Structures are given as C-alpha cells and as structure tokens.
Design a protein around this nucleic acid. Structure first.
Lengths: 792, 427, 157
RNA sequence: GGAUUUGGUGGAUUACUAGC
C-alpha cells in the first residue's frame, strides 16, 4: 500500500540518441532524454529502467549477450545496467562528449568513439562481483583530423573503422598483430561521411556522405590496394543523408535525409526498394535488427519513433509523443484506457497494459486543459483554452457536440455529471460556471457568484453535487438538480487552485496557495482537518534565478490533488519537483517522490554548482486498479505501481506460520487453512501455490469458509492475477463463488469494495467477453452454412 | 568461512596505521599507497582521492610497502605481493619461516629482508618482464658482520650494489656476485631510519639519540652530522626542489626542517601526529616539488607545503614556515556505535572511543568530516557550565537519527556514556 | 533614434528590446496588408482578422476592436511596450515611478496569481491585468498595510 | 576567561581507474 516504485514512463517514445534493437530483436529500446525505455514487440509491453540518467541520453550500447546495457550522457557519464538484473552494476565517468558506443560481436571489449579519439575498453564480466574500479581502457587512437561522426564494428574484433567528418575514413584492427593487415584511411570522399559499412566479405568497404553520393571501395591489383570500383549516387533536390544504417547479411541500406524522406537500397544491386516520408522533419537515428525485418526511424524535431518492416508493408509500432507536455490526465472506468491532454490540443489515448496510443484527436485547435470521463465507456469530455468544449465517443471516435459559451470564453477546467446529463466548465476570463446539457448543446445556465476565476470543478458521484473552486479564498458548493438552486459557501485562507472530491461524496479536498491541503465536509460547512505541505515540497532553483531555492514562492503549493478510491490517501503534485502521498486520517505523508533528476530541465536542483523548460507535474490521478497513480510530468506521463511485490508485508503471523507449513496444509488437504496461512504472509508465490492447487469440488465450500475480513483482499488478488494468466475457466469459478457465497455482503459494503469490483470487471470485459463473442460468432456462422441451401 | 550472501567490498574509515607509506609516480601524476592492516589503499597526491584498494585481504598484516611505477610491492608475513591496480597478479613466496621486515626494488632485482638477518634476491626473468619473479640467491648477514637490519636502500648509480643499513653499521652487497664489496665502520648509536640523498654517494642516517648522520660511501666517512635534543628519529626526507632542505621526523610527534646550506633549522612542526600512536612514521618531500607528505600512526595523512619566500632579493634566507594543506582523517580508536545518515547511503555517522564523532562518506572518500563540538551560545543568556580547558564529549553508546526534517532543526540524538543528559546534533 | 527614445520612456533592459517588438509590430501590418488584398466578401477574410482582433485586444495592444484602421495606424511598439509589467505596475499605481517598478520586480515583490514573476519584461494580457498583486508576506506589502493601520499578522502580512 | 565583526588559505559543493 505504501511502497510505490517507478514502474513505467508513458508518452515521449523517442527524445534523443541512438535507437538499437536487441540481439534476439524481440525487444526494441528507444532512449528518452533522462531515461531508457525498452519496448517488447512480441508481448506489446513497455518497460523503463528505474535509474535516472543525469542528463539526456546521447548514445545507447547493447551487448550481443544482452547482459550489459550502456547509455552515454552529454557530460560523458557511463551507466551500465544488466537487462535481466535491471540494476546499475557500475557508473564509470567518461570525460568528453560521446557520439556512439558499439559493443564488439565477440563482446570481450566495447569500441567507444569520443571526438577524434577511438577507444576500446575491456568489458567487466556481469557474472563477476562488483569492483571499486571496473572500467579499464585497452587503447586510444588520436590519428583523426576531426572527431569521428560514426563507429562501425566487423564480426572479428581485429578491425574497427570510424568515419571522420573531415572527409577521411580510417580502419583500426583490434589486436596489434592485425595492424599490418589494415591501417589505411580512405580519401577523396566529398562533403562528410555519415557512416562506414562492412559487408560479410571484408574485400568491399561501403562509405556514405552528407552530399548523398555513395562510393564503394574494392581491393584489387592496379602491390595493389583499395581502389574505388564503382560509385553509387542518390538524387535528392534538397535532402542530405543525416544517419545511415547498413545490415551486411541482408545488404539493406537505411538513409536519413533533412527532408525526412525514407529510402532503402541494396549494396550489391544498388536498387531503391522504397522511398517514404516518415515526417517533414529529417530522421536523426535509424537502426536495423539482425534479421533486418524491423527498421526503427526516429525524428528528434517531431519527437516521434516509427518502426517499419522491409519484407511486408506493415508497421509493428508507429506513434508520436506530445510536442510539449500533457496539461490534464484522464482515467476511464476500465484501468487499461488512459487519456492525456496536451498544450498543442491534440488528444491521444494511451493503454495501461501496453505503452502505445490507440488513436489521436485533432478536433481541438487550441490547447486542451482538462480531460475527464463520465461514469460510462461511451464518452469523455475535454476542456480547452479555445473557448469551446467537445465531447468524444470511444466506440466511434467522433464529436457528439461541441459545447460553446455565449461570448467565446477560454475554458480551463471541467466537471461531468456521473449520470452523464450535465457538463460544467470554468474559465479565467469570465469566472462564471457555464453548464451544458449533454443532449441539447445549449448552455442550460450560467452559474455565477465567484469573485476571481474558477480553478477547478468536480461532482461527487454519490450525492450528484458540484463544488466550485475560486481565487476569492471561498469554496462554494453548488446544488443544481431539482428545484433547489441553493449554493453553500465556505471561506478559505488562500487562493484555492486544487479541488478534490472523495468517492464517498461527503468530503472535499482542496489545495490552497499557502501550501496547506484542507479537507472539508459537504453536508456541514466545517472542516475535518488540514495537512501541512509547505515544508515537504522540494523546489528547484532555476538557472536564471536570483533567489535561493529555500525562499522562492514558485512551487510550494499544489496544482493538483486526487483522492484514492479507498478514500484514505491523497496524491498531490504541482509546479515543483516532488509528488506526495498524504494519509488522510493520520494526516501524515507516506512517501515523497522526486519526479526527475535532470540538469537539462530547470526545476531539479535545490543547489546549483558554483529559458530552460521548468519541471513540474500538471495533473495527477490514482487508477481504479490502484496499483499506481499516474502523474503527468514535463518528461512525460509517469506511472508508479506495486506490481513488483518484493516486500514482506505480513498480517497476523503466529510463530507456527512458516511458508513450509502452508505447503504441508495442501498435503493435509486443509484448503481453507492453507489459503488463510498463505494470506497471513501476503506473498504472491505462496498464494499462487495454494490458489492453483485446490480443486473445483471444494471451491464453494472454501468460498463459504472464507472470512468477511479477507473477502476484499482475496477479490483484489484474483483481479490482478487473472488478466495475464491462461486460466479463464478456473478463475471465473472463483469469481462465481466469491459473488455467490456473499452477494448481499459485497452489495451492502459498496464503499468497502471499490478497487476489487473495478479490477474484477475489467478482466471480464477485456478478455473474458471477447472469448465469448468469438465462441458466439463462430457458432452462428456454422449454423448459417448448414441451414442455408447449397449454391448452384 | 566462505559466505554465500556477503563478500567484502573494502574497509572504510582507515587511512594509515604506522607502516611507512611509499610514494610512486605515473606520468605527471603522483600516487601514494598506505596500508590498513591486511588491506592496503592508494591515494592520489593531487587531491587525495581514493584510487585503488586491494581486491582481497592479505592473510596477515602488511609489514612494509614500496611502489615502482605501476606495481605496488606489498609485503605481509612470509610472502611479497606484486600488485597492479589493487589486483594480485603475481604472488612471490620467500622460503623461510621468518617474517619479512623490509623491502627494496632496483633494476632487475627485488630485495626482501626477513627478520632473521637474511636478504633474498629476486631477479627479473627477462628484461622485457616488469615484475621480478625468479629467485636469484639468498644473502645473509651474520651478527659479526653487522647488527639487525634497519632498512634496505639502493643508492643512485651503483651497479647491483645494495646499501644494507643495520643497527650497527652499513653494508654493500653486489647481488650479481653475492659478495660484500664494502663494509662501513661501527656507529656509536643504534640506527633507526635511513634515507638516500639527491646528491651522489650519500645516504642519510637516523639514530635513537637525536643525531642525523650524513654518510658517504665513496669515502666511507661521515660528512655532516646534526644533533637533535631528546628525540628518536623516525623518518627522513630531502627536498629535491633545488633548495637544500632536510626533514627530520621524530617519534615524539615533531617534524623538524633544516637548511643544510645555511646550517640552520627553519621551522619545527609540533604534534602534527600523535606522540602516543607513534609520531611521524613517514615523511617525504615529493620529487622536485615543495610538498612534504606526513603520515603518522594515528590514522591520518597530511600534506604540508612551503609558500614562496616573501623577500624579493634575498630568497633562500627568509623562508616561509610550512603550511597546512589537504589531509584525510579517520578514527584513532575502534568505533562504538554507528548509523547511516540517509537513504542513498551517502553518509555514515561513526562515534568511537576516541570521543569524536565522524560523518564518514561511503561515496567519495575525501568528503568525510568530524562533526564539530562547539556549543551554541544559549538563548537564555546565562553562561554555559563547563570546564574551560575544552575536552571532548564522553563516548557515544546510543544514537538516533530521523532524516525527515534536516537543515531546519536538530535530527540526531546521541546518548553519551555515563551522563544523565543526552545531547543533540544537527546533521 | 526612435528605438532609444522609447526605451527611455518605458525603461527597457536591452536597447534591442524595441526592435524586438517592432519586428512583431511590423509583422502585424504585413499580415494586415495581405489580408487587405483578399476580396472583401470572402468568408475567410471576414472571419480571419476578427479572429485576430480578438487576440490583439485580449492582449491589450489596441484600444478598441471595432475600428479596423487601428490595426495599421495604432499598432505601435510603444503600444505593445506599455502592456509591459512595470508599466502596468505604474498604471495601477503600485510603484511610484516606472524605474521603481523595475526595481520591485527584480527584487521579487510582485506576482501574477500563484507564481511570482521575475522577468521585468513580462507581457500582461488585459484579462490577466486583473491579477497582479504584491507577493504575500513581502516587506513592501507589509508597509502598505501599516499605513492604513490594518496589518494582520495572522496572515503574517 | 567572555562576546561581536573581519582578512586569508585548505576540504566539500555529481559517484574515487595515475602525468607527458
């Protein structure tokens, strides 16, 4: 409940640096500005390493074995992370700017090129224990007029060739004895050489240039050495090759141009297979897999990563991250669906299960400020600064109606009636709460009475009451349904920019400008308590600042708050560097999360060493599944979670209860005990040992035997396990039994079980019904063929 | 006793212990090795970072150290390790049961001297080879020839001659033949420490009485002699900057500087290391540079420099007294109670029977500082009750620290041994 | 020296600030001109400058949104250089003079809503012109409240 | 013995693989 970890970063697929496929090619890794994200094409899952990188990734190195992954920052810091381990084995520091790092095919040593110097360093064994000084450098080459713009490695480690930007290209062997074989540097190349490629036969050397003219080097008699055999030229009106990737086995050449046109050629036949423009902006880094089936092209200017297969015209994954930042975060009733707003106004729907965007919405010309979902999967309402609010369908991907005001006002924020009849929005220009009906696109009423603008608006589902947020330091609770039209006002000490509505429908959580978060009642005007947030907020000193980070008033408030669906915890986040988790009854924070550690971003450091974009969280929500809360950052949408469960959180242990004892119960056939003895440890592998063990004939006997106290806990366990597990039929008999054993109790404690009901009924909708409908549709088609008369 | 979970990383909080540190030079940089018990360390001399600690603990204490350019020669009980980057790359075992007291390197040869007056010679097997490996021969010294071996020195420009200094007199052994080419005359005092000179044919000598004796080998005579009141000379070094300077390090904590040209002392340093733990065990002017490096046995290592002279025309007469430069510290006595400071494992509080708490650094080993003990002047206005000769706080047996509100008020509570109160500390 | 002559009247950081506005204030007229060369009964053109006068009045560089002639004649740099923040603090009578308002912004006494503002050259929208106040608990908002004998240190004003 | 103010150096202020 308390220990969250950084599970996933979502959005911003590609920021900068090399994009390199894995040796297997199952997983493709794209480097973000401060972190490295690994995408598995086969499992459609995105995983991001918990480690921060202190500036933006400039180079990515992947070992052929895959044991060690190296990322080089602009500063030259080197971070080594084992893919299986997912931990930083060593953090050596390079002292100059790194362009590309490529491990050798053997993997004994990794070639590294910095400036005009080429370095080969023996790689420390992953299996070997950590050492104080693991990094060792085998050799340094300084014979370059200018720093090499690219590095290429042959199958053997004897020859390493780096193409300089001067025009000249040089070849370096690994071992000193093979120096006599190859030490020559090519000359006469026009413009600059983007990269140098080696074919399976070492006789032919392929070079590329900025101009776009390609020259092939073939060794032959004029006692005779290294003529140009044939030249190959690519014709582009204004396009110039930027990044070139070549695969020797398939003889496939990937060319990157300033125009952004994508073209493919074969070195042996010099034939152009296809020319496609990924985007107007030029491709920065292109990489190829061993098979060569998947090619990844990423443009830094548009910040979009695209993967294409040459053999079949289908794209495994194509997506573009938000250009600036996500203004609002919207969570649908189903845990998987995620909606993120952007400054551009483009709306993209992310997926909780796999970090990809199902679709985009370009309906809002102006930037989108708030995106919210009504209590259905039918539609989502988005608030924009354009002055119009447009509802969207998710079955059909279309506007219903675009709600607008009278005198064309900006709209910050938004509130949707849970029974989806009424959409309310609020401004900075007007400070009148406009109210639209969902059916008739007219505005029903202009609810007014605030001095100063409305910051936020929310509706409690249980009581259907909307509470306004004002800069006048007074919180007014509206009651708008059914012949009442009565507004209750509660005074607040400082401008309230944060409004949170509890699931209960009885409490309202606020975030004022003094820092302090207050929790009010609704049926009474009084407050339960307030929790003090000015001290435990980390604030950055910007680069252009003139004050200490201690006494600036930039970031010590909270520009968002969201209650957990338990109603017991608040996650807050503002224009600061930090996110919080306050407990609501005990009134004490639980754990404080630093969003990012980048010198590249501004608001990170409390103390600088002796404009840049500010780093701040915009909108935070806790998911219905409730494992993690997503906070929408500058770097992109973060996701925190507890899906690890590497943690010993026991409950009611006796001395008699050990993991072995639970296993003994299965032999004893005491299913009721061995489940409770496994719930006492609260460890998932003992539970899966006893959940998968007990048979069908004693599931309901066990369900009746299960205590009321463990009913909420057992339901949550089934919800997280059955989504990725092959047993449909065995899991549903449990959910039949838990519901069948105590239908009334679960219904009576509707507030007590919220996360369990939502998690269980995502498993039923997403994977269980689609198996049903395919079984249903297939059966009807067979019935139609036999029933219908034969043709001719 | 091999564990399955844990494996030792390095020992932290220890700089020196009393074994004489030995300097080495790589490229233009200067690297200084010390030892800690059974595991030696390597410090840079330009900023005193920690560069290398050894990969395994030695089976016993390192008795003597020396370092030729890349290779650190470490000598524990029966064996001599020839270490590069803290990695044991060649273990050289001496064929006695005696324990090795002193060690020396020149040329193709290694020269190790056990305690029972026996000197072992190890040759480079090839001139291509970097570490000497093959056992050449066994040189002995009977007690009619000289006393117990004080040290082994190899002077400049002597083909295979090894200046063996003893408690009685000074020897010379041509290690190619194995023969005593020259023996000196017997000295009236017990010799404690010898060191060569940047001049030709001269080794410097140090007695248990306070006498430094310059001794020529070509003439076999005493050229100069320097008397010191009431001191046991423990370390000698010459400044090679171009200005003649001798540094005599006592065992009563004093470091004493001479000017051999002017025949005068210049400035005497008092208590730069503790008298009780051994005084100045080793002091060395770095080559051609005005930096002397002092390392006592009281778990510290300090550098002192000479500023340039304030006189324009005079120069060598008006000499600036030496000046404190960077240093590293540790813990004199063993630590009683420690704790970790923060979540990223970046500081460790350590309070010991030395009565002085230390905030050591796991991260960078030059970042460790003693927490000050300097009482805040009271809010109330009445004066603080305490002895005017300030003594340290009694030793700390219970510590508590919660890091949540740091930098705004106190967050460390320590309970001292046998005190009815218990103080607080800001982190 | 028109660029200097209006840098003094409004107090500008760099003498290049003027021609940093006068490139924009010229770019208004170049879009005004080509939108005058479209035929008059064009539902693009009729939509498109009224789309623009919405923005140039919200930002407040021009006094009215009715007169279409203002868009070439009244769009001056000294018009856009008096929706600067220190001019607005002198218009709203916050500081006494216009140099003294730059002195209070740079020292950090003024704010817009939540966050204090520190660049002197902050353009302020006519809509956002409502929300400039002295930053709270400041030593210059404390002195004001002492003049009316109306401090309240529970606010720690 | 006590208090206030100030000049200068050294060590930190990112995570320790030696100089040309």
């Amino acid at each position: 409940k308390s220990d969250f970890k950084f599970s996933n970063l979502l959005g911003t697929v590609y920021r900068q640096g090399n994009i390199t496929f894995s040796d297997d090619g199952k997983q493709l890794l794209s480097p973000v500005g401060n972190r490295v994200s690994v995408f598995d094409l086969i499992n459609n899952k995105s995983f991001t390493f918990e480690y921060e990188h202190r500036k933006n990734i400039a180079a990515i190195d992947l070992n052929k074995q895959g044991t060690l992954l190296i990322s080089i920052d602009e500063d030259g810091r080197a971070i080594l992370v084992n893919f299986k381990a997912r931990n930083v084995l060593h953090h050596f520091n390079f002292k100059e700017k790194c362009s590309a790092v490529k491990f050798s095919p053997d993997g004994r040593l990794f070639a590294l090129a910095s400036g005009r110097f080429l370095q080969i360093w023996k790689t420390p064994d992953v299996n070997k224990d950590r050492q104080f000084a693991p990094f060792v450098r085998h050799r340094v080459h300084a014979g370059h007029f200018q720093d090499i713009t690219s590095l290429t490695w042959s199958q053997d480690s004897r020859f390493i060739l780096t193409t300089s930007k001067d025009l000249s290209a040089k070849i370096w062997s690994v071992d000193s004895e093979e120096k006599n074989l190859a030490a020559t540097t090519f000359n006469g190349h026009r413009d600059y050489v983007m990269g140098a490629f080696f074919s399976h036969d070492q006789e032919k050397i392929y070079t590329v240039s900025k101009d776009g003219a390609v020259f092939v080097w073939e060794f032959t008699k004029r006692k005779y050495s290294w003529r140009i055999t044939k030249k190959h030229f690519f014709y582009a009106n204004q396009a110039k090759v930027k990044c070139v990737t070549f695969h020797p086995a398939t003889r496939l050449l990937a060319v990157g141009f300033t125009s952004g046109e994508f073209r493919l050629y074969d070195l042996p036949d010099f034939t152009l297979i296809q020319q496609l423009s990924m985007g107007q902006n030029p491709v920065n880094t292109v990489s190829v897999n061993q098979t060569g089936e998947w090619l990844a092209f990423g443009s830094s200017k548009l910040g979009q990563l695209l993967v294409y297969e040459w053999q079949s015209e289908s794209y495994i994954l194509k997506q573009q991250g938000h250009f600036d930042s996500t203004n609002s975060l919207a969570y649908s009733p189903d845990g998987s669906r995620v909606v993120t707003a952007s400054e551009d106004g483009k709306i993209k729907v992310w997926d909780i299960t796999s970090g990809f965007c199902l679709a985009t919405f370009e309906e809002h010309t102006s930037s989108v400020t708030a995106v919210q979902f009504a209590k259905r999967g039918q539609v989502m309402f988005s608030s924009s600064l354009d002055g119009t609010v447009r509802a969207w369908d998710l079955i059909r991907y279309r506007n219903f109606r675009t709600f607008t005001g009278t005198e064309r006002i900006q709209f910050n924020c938004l509130a949707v009636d849970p029974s989806g009849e009424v959409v309310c929005a609020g401004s900075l220009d007007n400070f009148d709460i406009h109210v639209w009906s969902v059916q008739t696109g007219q505005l029903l009423d202009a609810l007014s009475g605030h001095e100063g603008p409305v910051s936020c608006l929310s509706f409690s589902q249980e009581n259907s009451v909307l509470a306004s947020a004002s800069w006048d330091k007074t919180i007014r609770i509206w009651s708008i349904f059914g012949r009442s039209q009565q507004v209750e006002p509660i005074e607040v000490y400082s401008d309230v920019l944060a409004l949170s509505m509890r699931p209960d429908g009885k409490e309202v959580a606020v975030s004022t400008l003094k820092g302090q978060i207050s929790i009010f009642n609704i049926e009474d005007a009084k407050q339960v308590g307030n929790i003090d947030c000015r001290k435990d907020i980390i604030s950055g000193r910007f680069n252009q600042d003139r004050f200490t980070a201690k006494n600036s008033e930039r970031s010590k408030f909270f520009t968002t708050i969201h209650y957990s669906f338990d109603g017991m915890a608040i996650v807050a986040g503002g224009n600061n560097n930090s996110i919080c988790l306050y407990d609501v009854p005990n009134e004490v924070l639980l754990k404080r999360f630093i969003v990012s550690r980048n010198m590249a971003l501004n608001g990170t450091l409390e103390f600088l060493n002796s404009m840049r974009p500010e780093v701040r969280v915009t909108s935070v929500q806790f998911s219905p599944t409730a494992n993690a809360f997503a906070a929408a950052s500058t770097e992109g949408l973060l996701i925190y979670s507890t899906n690890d469960t590497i943690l010993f959180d026991p409950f009611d242990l006796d001395v008699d209860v050990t993991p072995h004892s639970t296993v003994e119960a299965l032999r004893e056939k005491q299913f009721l005990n061995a489940l409770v003895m496994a719930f006492r440890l609260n460890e998932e592998y003992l539970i899966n040992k006893v959940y998968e063990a007990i048979p069908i004939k004693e599931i309901p006997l066990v369900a009746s035997n299960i205590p009321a106290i463990y009913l909420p806990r057992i339901l949550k366990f089934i919800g997280d396990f059955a989504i990725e597990s092959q047993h449909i039929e065995f899991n549903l008999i449990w959910i039949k039994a838990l519901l069948s054993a105590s239908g009334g109790y679960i219904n009576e404690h509707k507030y007590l079980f919220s996360t369990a009901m939502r998690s269980i009924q995502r498993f039923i909708v997403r994977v269980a019904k689609e198996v049903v409908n395919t079984t249903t549709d297939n059966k009807y088609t067979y019935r139609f063929l036999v029933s219908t008369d034969g043709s001719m | 006793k091999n564990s399955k979970i844990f494996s030792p990383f390095r020992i932290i909080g220890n700089v020196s212990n009393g074994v004489p540190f030995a300097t080495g030079t790589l490229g233009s940089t200067f690297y200084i090795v010390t030892c800690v018990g059974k595991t030696f360390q390597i410090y840079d001399a330009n900023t005193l970072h920690l560069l290398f600690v050894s990969e395994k603990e030695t089976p016993s204490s390192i008795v003597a150290l020396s370092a030729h350019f890349h290779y650190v020669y470490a000598a524990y009980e029966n064996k001599v390790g020839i270490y590069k980057r803290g990695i044991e790359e060649h273990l050289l075992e001496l064929e006695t049961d005696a324990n090795v007291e002193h060690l020396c390197i020149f040329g193709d040869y290694l020269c190790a001297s056990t305690d029972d007056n026996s000197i072992f010679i190890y040759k480079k097997s090839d001139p291509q080879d970097k570490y000497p490996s093959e056992f050449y021969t066994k040189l002995t010294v009977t007690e009619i020839q000289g006393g117990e071996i004080v040290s082994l020195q190899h002077l400049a420009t002597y083909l295979n001659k090894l200046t063996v200094v003893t408690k009685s007199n000074v020897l010379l052994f041509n290690v190619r033949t194995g023969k005593l080419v020259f023996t000196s005359n017997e000295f009236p005092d017990q010799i404690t420490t010898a060191e060569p000179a940047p001049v030709l044919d001269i080794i410097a000598l140090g007695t248990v009485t306070g006498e430094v004796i310059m001794f020529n080998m070509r003439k076999g005579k005493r050229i100069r002699t320097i008397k010191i009141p009431q001191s046991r000379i423990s370390s000698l070094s010459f400044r090679t900057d171009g200005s003649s300077h001798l540094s005599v390090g006592t065992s009563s904590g004093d470091l004493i500087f001479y000017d051999l040209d002017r025949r005068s002392r210049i400035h005497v340093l008092k208590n730069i290391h503790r008298e009780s733990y051994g005084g100045v065990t080793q002091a060395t002017f770095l080559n051609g540079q005005p930096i002397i490096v002092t390392s006592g046995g009281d778990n510290s290592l300090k550098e002192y420099v000479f500023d340039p002279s304030l006189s324009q025309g005079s120069g060598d007469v008006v000499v600036q007294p030496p000046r404190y430069l960077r240093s590293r510290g540790g813990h004199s006595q063993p630590p009683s109670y420690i704790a970790f400071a923060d979540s990223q494992s970046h500081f460790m509080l350590s309070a010991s029977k030395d009565r002085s708490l230390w905030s050591f650094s796991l991260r960078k080993d030059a970042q460790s500082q003693e927490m000050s003990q300097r009482l805040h002047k009271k809010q109330d206005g009445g004066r603080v009750g305490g002895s005017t000769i300030k003594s340290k706080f009694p030793e700390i047996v219970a510590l508590a620290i919660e890091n949540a509100r740091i930098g705004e008020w106190e967050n460390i509570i320590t309970a001292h041994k046998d005190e009815k109160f218990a103080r607080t500390w800001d982190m | 020296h028109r660029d200097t002559q209006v840098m003094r009247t409004y107090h500008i950081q760099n003498r290049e600030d003027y021609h940093k506005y006068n490139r924009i204030c010229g770019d208004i007229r170049r879009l005004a001109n080509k939108l005058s060369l479209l035929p008059p009964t064009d539902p693009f053109r009729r939509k498109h400058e009224q789309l623009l006068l919405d923005k140039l009045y919200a930002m407040g560089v021009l006094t009215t949104k009715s007169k279409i002639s203002d868009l070439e004649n009244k769009v001056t740099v000294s018009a856009i250089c008096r929706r600067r923040l220190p001019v607005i603090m002198h218009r709203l009578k916050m500081a006494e003079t216009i140099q003294d308002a730059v002195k209070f912004i740079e020292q950090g006494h003024v704010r817009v809503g939540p966050n204090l503002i520190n660049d002197p050259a902050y353009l302020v929208t006519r809509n956002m012109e409502d929300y400039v106040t002295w930053v709270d608990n400041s030593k210059i908002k404390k002195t004001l409240l002492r003049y009316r004998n109306q401090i309240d240190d529970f606010d720690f004003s």
